[PDB]
Nucleic acid binder design. Structure first.
Ligand SMILES: [Mg+2]
Lengths: 56, 114, 120, 122, 209
RNA sequence: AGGACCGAACCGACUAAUGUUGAAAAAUUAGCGGAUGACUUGUGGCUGGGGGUGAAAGGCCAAUCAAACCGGGAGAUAGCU
RNA sequence: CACAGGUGGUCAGGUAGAGAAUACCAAGGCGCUUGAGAGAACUCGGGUGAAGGAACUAGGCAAAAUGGUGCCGUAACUUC
RNA sequence: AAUUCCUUGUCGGGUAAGUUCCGACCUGCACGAAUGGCGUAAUGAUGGCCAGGCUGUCUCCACCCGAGACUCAGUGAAAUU
RNA sequence: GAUGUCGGCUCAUCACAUCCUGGGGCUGAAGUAGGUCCCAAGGGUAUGGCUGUUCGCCAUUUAAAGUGGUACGCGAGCUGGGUUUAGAACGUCGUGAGACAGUUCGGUCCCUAUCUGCCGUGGGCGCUGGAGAACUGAGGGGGGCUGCUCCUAGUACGAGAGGACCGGAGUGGACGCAUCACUGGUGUUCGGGUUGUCAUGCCAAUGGCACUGCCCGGUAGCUAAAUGCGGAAGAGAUAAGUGCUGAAAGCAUCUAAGCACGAAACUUGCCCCGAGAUGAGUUCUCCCUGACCCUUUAAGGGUCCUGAAGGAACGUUGAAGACGACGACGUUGAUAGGCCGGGUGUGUAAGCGCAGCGAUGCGUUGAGCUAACCGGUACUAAUGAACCGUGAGGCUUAA
């Protein structure tokens, strides 16, 4: 249920070795607007694959 | 499943008479006793029909000497030789399992004239 | 075990699921563009596209089926009067899902669902 | 599909009306007696002044089941009740003379020929 | 003698005139094309590598493309190997058909069984459930005890517990060959065989027979 | 008529599951007993610790009871840890 | 503790109902202050289940089952 | 026997099989007459036994619907050492 | 300054002083059936009534219902009947308070797993230039049970009664793996019936809510009770045992030399895992074939050009899956949804007409609707890109 011995800094770090975050590999550039966006996601201005399909 | 469909329709019978649940039916089935082969008649009420192409079946109930007897025939089996509709019954359900609970005059089915 | 099953439970019972998709289909037919979660849009496809397909042949029976599945006479009217004639030459694919980032409150993936020719 | 503690009707004129299966004979840990399988039974109801009497322990053969038998073409024959035919312990021949109700061809073995001969059907 | 690679089209039945119904698995075996012959000198053992089916010309990679071009055969959906029984001979590029099983009476079928994922002990090992009532506290399908008291002081290796079930190589031995159909490239085999419909199967002659 | 019967409110607490670092220092759900009476309940008052009260279980007397709590004798005493 | 508990009295709509039970509603008021997915083991709360029917177990624990109105009929025993 | 050690006393009933139960017996270790004896209709969330019905209690578990479990974002304990 | 007790359930594991099955010596072994001893631990090895029971008695089985160890295995796995609290009562003892290895009724079982272990599943690096596959197999795990019937044969044996060895065939029980063609279960995502109530202005028709309201059926999937398969044969070396030849010891002797048999035990043969097998293996294919500077000269550092094979990431996803992982697919496209056709299920929709006073019935009509299924179809969504991965790969000796 509970420890008998305090685990160490070392074992803490080894357990945390798989906690690293994977940064975004590469952002896609819009062909019309040239904005950077996540692939298959629309741009902040509302573009996607060169077309402005967003009301705003 | 083109392949399985071809294999099945290679074996599906052709002269299956059209019948519905609630119809009284006579089924002639082959029986082998030793080397001789003979026909035995099973007459009863069609209480269930399963339509699955080659795997089509149907259940027939008859009261044989006080006790009911249900036989689930496989319509495309060579064991079953001929099927004949003796009486057209009028029901509203695809399956008539309530006839198990029913007995006697309550088990009667009105004849159809459509 | 989920072998060959369809439909997402979406952490709701079936009654809540039916009611939610009824409301959401009404909203999509009304506005022609709605922001929702990605899986919700994936299921709204299956809810809304059959309804528009039903809205092709204009008959009283189809009107009553649509009203049974929608419970909004304005939505039924818009379907049979506008979206039937609009999509009458299209074989399915009446809708479009565009992924649009994540929700701030809970990091849920977000998608716009649109009718393929809304012109707004 | 007959287990221990299950009640069976009697399809013969040996006198017993209802019997209870108390051991499924065969091998060890054997679960079920189907049609044509020998069971050990105790008589729970019997007509007065019959060959057998209440409380007797003897052998029987299952001749009808609700679970039914499967035929080689894949058909199933089910019955509205489970019934058996009483047998002597040390000779395995039927106690009674008449057999009531239908039977199946699963009893087509050299030992149950006497049941098949006097059965009214099959 | 060698086997062949096909796919599980599914299950059906064959009615015979005698009045019996035989449940058959339908295995579609197209032409197995030999891609490589292994010999005792170069490779150390006698085997034939074979491929079957088609594969997209863009999804075949250059390594595999060159490997197929070496044998001068079209690229299939995989590569399998069969060991030669010291008397038989095959050449690279040969096409082995279902007629190989013309005289085979019994076969063994190897395939990947359906995957059940993480399976508990009741399903995976036929463990008997504890009492559903009579005071049982949260311990209905639990495995129960898993060892002795402190004399071993450990769980023994190889113990039956919960984990992955299915999705593993399984062979079924001594299955009757019902029908061998050259024109339609089909083999009907009595009984169920491992895997889902549309999955790769390796059919060999029975080793036990 | 009834310390009558079935049964809500209300008063209770027989069984089971849950929960047991609880939602809760005694509860929740499903069932369960009484339910015009020796009933129940609000407001105020009285009985005080070798004392009270007790259809009596050593029960209850502010989550404390084979002798409450607070302060004192008091740094009791401890051949023991 | 923004805590599934406790807290006296008054008001008492419609339909069905003996009813202040119960179901659905009105007035009125709320969705309970983390959510999004997925649809493993196992746990908790439920639904259904072939054949058998207490063989379970310390024990029919728990579940299943019965259940309303009217008429008929109603045993041993009894302080009537 | 809420009382009997030997004791699962003996015989019978009920079960295929009954240390439990019911009835009779009497060698009452160690009943007994207001610390009441022996019966008793009715009452009982009372102990023991048997039967009809019912059933996932069980043979022997299967499938399904929800809440957790698992992953993602936010906040962020505990015993122990 | 706490190592939870008896019995039960779940899960087991070893020993062999063997219960069954195998091999054999003797037998007061004629045969069947036994007894006893020796070898043998591969597999198998009851269900109920009574009782808290372990035992035990009894009933009925089985090839057998083995004996022991494992904290009299197993409560951070379950239970709590028994023992071992507080209430109460009987017998007995005691003046009493009380007491009893007497009996009786009632009577709270906590723990979110850090480490070892174990069952599964991944990330990293390594394996010496990188990458994609296919393997060998060192090593490891699984599995190994058995009944009954018939033939040989009513033969051998036997006064009869009875009645085989060896060999062959079939058919079962328990156990295990796979699977969904069949028989079914389930199927709150499909269809229908019906109760009460609210609602959509009302009729008609539908919807919500009442355990999916209550029910009747039922697709795909999952599944057992369903149906296929399996335990082997064979080989090698042996145990007890049986021998052949054969001296020591002129004979005799299975043993000293030499030779031949011999069991479910051992090693293989059967299935699965398997090169982190750091002893890191083998085979096939693919790919990269540019210039300059620098100095502690080395398997050194740096700038520019180049960035291949492949991978990864992202997306549509799966009979794959807790998450990773694994498989399919991304316009050179059937990967998912939709759509069309079919199929299956339910069982003759609504509207309308006709008959009837009316409930309702008949016709249009086997109608309407129909999840996961089958065959098709680019309608929607799977993007031009970018990202990681380099630029011929050390020394020594030998041919
Ligand atoms: Mg439970």
């Amino acid at each position: 249920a509970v420890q008998q011995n305090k685990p160490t800094r070392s074992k803490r770090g080894m357990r945390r070795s798989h906690d690293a975050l994977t940064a975004v590999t590469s952002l896609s550039v819009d062909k019309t607007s040239g904005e950077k966006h996540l692939r298959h996601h629309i741009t902040a201005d509302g573009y996607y694959r060169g077309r402005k399909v967003i009301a705003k | 499943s083109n392949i399985i469909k071809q294999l099945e329709q290679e074996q599906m019978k052709q002269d299956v008479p059209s019948f519905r649940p609630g119809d009284t039916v006579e089924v002639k089935v082959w029986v082998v006793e030793g080397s001789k082969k003979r026909l035995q008649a099973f007459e009863g009420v069609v209480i269930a029909i399963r339509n699955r192409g080659l795997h089509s079946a149907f259940t027939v109930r008859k009261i044989s000497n006080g006790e009911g007897v249900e036989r689930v025939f496989q319509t495309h089996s060579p064991v079953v030789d001929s099927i004949s509709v003796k009486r057209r019954g009028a029901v509203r359900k695809a399956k008539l399992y309530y006839l198990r609970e029913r007995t006697g005059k309550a088990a009667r089915i009105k004849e159809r004239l459509n | 075990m989920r072998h060959r099953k369809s439909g997402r439970q979406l952490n709701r019972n079936s009654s809540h699921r039916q009611a939610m998709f009824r409301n959401m289909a009404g909203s999509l037919v009304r506005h022609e563009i709605i922001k929702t979660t990605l899986p919700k849009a994936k299921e709204l496809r299956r809810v809304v596209e059959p309804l528009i397909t039903l809205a092709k042949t204009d008959s009283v029976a189809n009107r009553r089926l649509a009203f049974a599945r929608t419970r909004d006479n304005e939505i039924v009217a818009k379907l049979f009067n506008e979206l039937g004639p609009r999509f009458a030459s299209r074989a399915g694919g009446y809708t479009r899902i565009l992924k649009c980032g994540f929700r701030a409150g809970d990091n849920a993936p977000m998608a716009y669902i649109e009718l393929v020719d809304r012109s707004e | 599909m007959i287990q221990e503690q299950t009640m069976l009707n009697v399809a013969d004129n040996s006198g017993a009306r209802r019997v209870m299966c108390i051991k499924v004979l065969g091998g060890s840990h054997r679960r079920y007696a189907g049609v044509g399988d020998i069971i050990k039974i105790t008589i729970k109801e019997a007509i007065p002044r019959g060959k057998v009497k209440k409380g007797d322990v003897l052998k029987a053969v299952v001749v009808r089941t609700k679970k039914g038998v499967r035929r080689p073409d894949g058909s199933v024959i089910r019955f509205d009740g489970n019934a058996c035919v009483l047998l002597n312990n040390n000779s395995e021949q039927p106690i009674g003379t008449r057999i009531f109700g239908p039977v199946t061809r699963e009893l087509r073995s050299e030992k149950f020929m006497k049941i098949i001969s006097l059965a009214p059907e099959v | 003698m060698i086997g062949l690679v096909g796919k599980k089209v599914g299950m059906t039945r064959i009615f015979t005139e005698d009045g019996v119904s035989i449940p058959v698995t339908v295995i579609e075996v197209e032409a197995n094309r030999v891609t490589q012959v292994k010999d005792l000198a170069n490779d150390g053992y006698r085997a034939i590598q074979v491929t079957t089916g088609a594969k997209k010309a863009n999804r075949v990679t250059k390594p595999e493309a060159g490997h197929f071009a070496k044998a001068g055969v079209e690229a299939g959906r995989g590569l399998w190997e069969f060991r030669l029984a010291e008397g038989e001979e095959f050449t690279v590029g040969q096409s082995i058909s279902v007629e190989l099983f013309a005289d085979v009476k019994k076969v063994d079928v190897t395939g990947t069984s359906k995957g059940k994922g993480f399976a508990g002990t009741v399903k995976r090992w036929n463990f008997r459930t504890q009492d559903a009532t009579h005071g049982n506290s949260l311990s209905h399908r639990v495995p129960g005890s898993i060892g002795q008291n402190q004399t071993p002081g450990k769980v023994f290796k190889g113990k039956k517990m919960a984990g992955q079930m299915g999705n593993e190589r399984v062979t079924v031995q001594s299955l009757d060959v019902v029908r061998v159909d050259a024109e339609r490239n089909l083999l009907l085999v009595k009984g169920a065989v491992p895997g889902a419909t549309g999955s790769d199967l390796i059919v060999k002659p029975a080793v036990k027979a």
